[PDB]
């Protein structure tokens with residue numbers, strides 16, 4: 268039934284060997300949990316393995332691969348509801364949903380993530396400030412718990428506490444077998460985008476707190492983290508909203524829902540070029556153009572700093588560029604309101620993802636960053652993390668004790684466990 272397998276997160280680091288059950292048979296899954304529950308080092312569900320960290324592996328224990336469980340059960344355009352197996356991925360879901368005029372309500376940077384993964388990490392996207400994160404759009408889920416019973420959870424009424432502990436719970440309340448998502452109605456597969464380019468960090472912040480952000484449903488930015496000030500924190504901002512059919516050019520209006528370095532570069536002329544090409548209004552783009560503006564030895568690092576703490580945010584960015592650690596691929600966004608999940612990552616404030624080449628001193632440098640992020644009231648994302656301490660984590664997520672208490676009810680015997688749970692002491 269199982270197979271000894273060497274697993275790593277997307278970051279290809281911190282490997283552990285587990286026994287991996289891969290089956291499309293939901294009853295065999297129920298029975299494997301029932302088995303582990305009788306006996307140990309517990310079990311954890313795994314999706315497409317896109318989380319960079321250690322949350323979907325379980326050294327010396329059981330790992331259940333959920334991807335073969337990928338049935339879309341129904342889609343209903345009138346209710347906007349979608350009933351799907353947890354192994355369904357968001358790209359699969361997106362293609363199936365389109366002909367109904369339905370848009371996946373939250374999309375992350377890659378569509379190769381399972382619904383179970385999207386819920387357990389409570390994922391966010393370019394529309395977080397207008398739409399929240401993934402958990403906000405789940406109307407029901409079926410959770411396989413430690414007792415081998417399947418519980419039907421909904422965001423309100425009874426069992427809401429377990430529901431909201433599961434969202435962002437990193438698989439640690441049990442296995443999401445199935446869920447109902449409420450989709451976003453759309454009449455097209457396209458975006459209308461405005462683009463803006465700023466010349467400094469001070470400007471980037473300025474553009475994000477002037478009010479204009481309320482005019483867009485989607486917003487994010489490419490961020491210079493390498494240049495010394497003033498150029499530090501300059502950005503290319505891409506903001507927009509889903510087009511309606513009347514906004515499409517003629518050629519595209521018959522099929523509105525279908526998805527299908529020189530010598531000048533670092534000089535004044537390319538400064539003008541980049542500025543010009545990054546500044547546009549009412550441009551219609553497909554998903555790949557708008558949302559997908561696109562390995563081994565890198566360290567992903569993502570944090571959010573509370574909105575008010577803006578001077579502290581500027582401080583952290585300053586620390587980053589003068590560190591001698593250079594990140595070229597940086598994504599910035601202002602998050603909106605948070606949800607009620609205790610371990611949910613997003614909070615209203617300044618969010619950034621960076622990507623550091625693995626190098627001498629980087630490990631000790633990120634620990635120091637951790638300290639700064641913590642002190643500044645912010646947190647890091649478990650999906651992007653493999654090396655922070657339990658002490659740092661628990662301070663970053665003050666409702667962790669609230670969460671752990673919920674987990675102890677539903678898993679007294681510690682049937683569900685992962686590398687991350689042990690490292691972060693969520694066990």
Ligand SMILES: Cc1cc2nc3c(=O)[nH]c(=O)nc-3n(C[C@H](O)[C@H](O)[C@H](O)COP(=O)(O)OP(=O)(O)OC[C@H]3O[C@@H](n4cnc5c(N)ncnc54)[C@H](O)[C@@H]3O)c2cc1C
Nearest residue numbers: 314315316317318375376381383384387390391437438443
């Ligand atoms: C290139 C890239 C870009 C990304 N961009 C973003 C982004 O913009 N925003 C964002 O929020 N994230 C982003 N991520 C992270 C990704 O969205 C999350 O890590 C997501 O959880 C990955 O889903 P997965 O199916 O691969 O799950 P895995 O990585 O396999 O698992 C992640 C967690 O979900 C749990 N889980 C999986 N299935 C189940 C289940 N059926 N029941 C219970 N628990 C389950 C696992 O136990 C594990 O704890 C990105 C990742 C990559 C590689």
